[PDB]
Structure formats: structure tokens, C-alpha cells
Amino acid sequence: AEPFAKLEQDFGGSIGVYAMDTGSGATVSYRAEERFPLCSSFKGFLAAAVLARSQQQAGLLDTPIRYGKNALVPWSPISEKYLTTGMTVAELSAAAVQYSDNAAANLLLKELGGPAGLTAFMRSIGDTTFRLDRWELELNSAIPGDARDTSSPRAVTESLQKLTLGSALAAPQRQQFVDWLKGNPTGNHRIRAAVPADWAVGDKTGTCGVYGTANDYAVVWPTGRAPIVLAVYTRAPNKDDKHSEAVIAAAARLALEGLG
């Protein structure tokens, strides 16, 4: 705990970390079973849920969604761009992962039966911690003590392992999920700043902002070695506290360094 504890004193909040080396089975854990707000990080699992549904509902991914302007939400750069023409379920899924597109996330949540439907998918793969309760943008409130729209670093990492490396998704769906996670058009740092430059990274960030709340999870492939899965989540006690990308990167470095 000691290096992580010092880091969270410099941050002024709480940090939760879980990392697993899928080769050795080694793990690093700090506050890994505490709850933290998901923020936009749920959008990675949302896309995985859509891919899983496609296995039982062939034709889903190519379905055109001709949404109206009322479906749009602040920070929906792709769905706003294509408002006049519409987008397929697959295109909305790519936008939700790669651009954190909020309207795309709400439209896809509708396809799955809402936040409860996404939560049920996570339960179906063995994740009993994840809960999504609200839609964009309400889910980002990050109020201290509120368990709505939260998970734990350990549950996030374990679920990400199952979906990107395990057999929770069929291999073609799995490869699509990985490919979406590897796209980095918003140019995020965080875990990407912690890994060696030759490692491949599939990541999804979250930035509630309020209460210094921000996070990142990733599957990372060291060249020629077994992949590592990790999650770093933060929150802070005061509404006005600023999140820190540098703290997330620093905690991710410690996690990678702490593995055996």
C-alpha cells in the first residue's frame, strides 16, 4: 500500500487500483474492492454488451438508427456529425468507445433495455459489482457515498479480462471489441502514458470531473509477452476538486512495476 498511499496524499483523494499479469497470475491491488464512479468508462462495457447481443440477434450491428436531434447530448461529437444521415448500431458502438459519444451511449442503452440491461449483461459474465442505474448525463454526478453507476477496480479488471482475452465473447466479437479499444482518436494519456511505447494498448477513460473523479482501464500487450489488464479509478471529497490525469498515470506505473 505504501507507494499508493503516498500518491493519494499528494492527490488529495482516493485511488483504487487493480492489475493482473495474465502470464504469471501476479496481481497488484489497492482499494481494489472499493466503489468508484464509472463515468464514461461504462461505455466500453456497453459496446461489449452490444457485441454479445449480436451473437444471439444476428443483424443487430447493421441496423440503421435514424435518431432525432432530441437524442443528442452534450459531448456527442460523432452522433451530432451524422445527425442528418443516422448511424448503424455498430457505428454508434464505435463512437461510444472511441469518442465517449454520449448520445450514442444512450441510444445503445435503449437497445439493451436500459442501464438495468447493461447491468444484467455484466452479471451474466460473473460481475456482481458493476451497476449502471442512470443515463447520460445524470450518471456522472459522482456524489460521495452514492453507489449508483459505480464499480470496483477489481471487478472492472476481471470483466475486461473476460471480454478481451477470455471467452465471454466469441472470437470475432472479441477482436472487434479489442479493435475499438485500441482506437485512440481523442488522444488520451493516463495508462497510455505509463506503458512502454512499444506495447499495444486498448483503453477506455472516464472523467466525471466533479469530486475529482476520473478513471481509466486497459488491456496492454507487452511485445511477445502475456497481456496485462488493469484499472485505475479516482475520486475526491469536495465537489470542486480537480481530477488528475497525472495521478492516474502514476498509479498505473506503480501497478505495472508491482507485478511479478
Residues assigned a catalytic role: 40, 138
Q: How far is the CB of 191 from Na ion (least distance, A)?
A: 15
Under rule CB under 5 A, residue 28 binds Na ion: yes
Torsion of CA 57, 63, 68, 69, to 10 degrees: 90
Q: What is the largest CA-CA distance in the chain?
A: 54
Q: Are 78 and 101 in contact (CB under 8 A)?
A: yes
Sheet holding 27-30, edge to edge: 27-30, 14-21, 228-235, 214-221, 200-206
**x-or-dash string of contact with Na ion, 46-75, rule CB under 5 A:** ------------------------------
Q: How far is the CB of 22 from Na ion (least distance, A)?
A: 15
Identify residues 173-212 at the interface with Na ion (CB under 5 A).
198
Q: How far is the CB of 201 from Na ion (least distance, A)?
A: 10
**x-or-dash string of contact with Na ion, 74-113, rule CB under 5 A:** ----------------------------------------
Under rule CB under 5 A, residue 223 binds Na ion: yes
Distance CA(152)–CA(178), nearest Å, equals: 21
Q: Are 213 and 39 in contact (CB under 8 A)?
A: yes
Q: Which residues bind Na ion (CB under 5 A)?
A: 28, 198, 223, 258
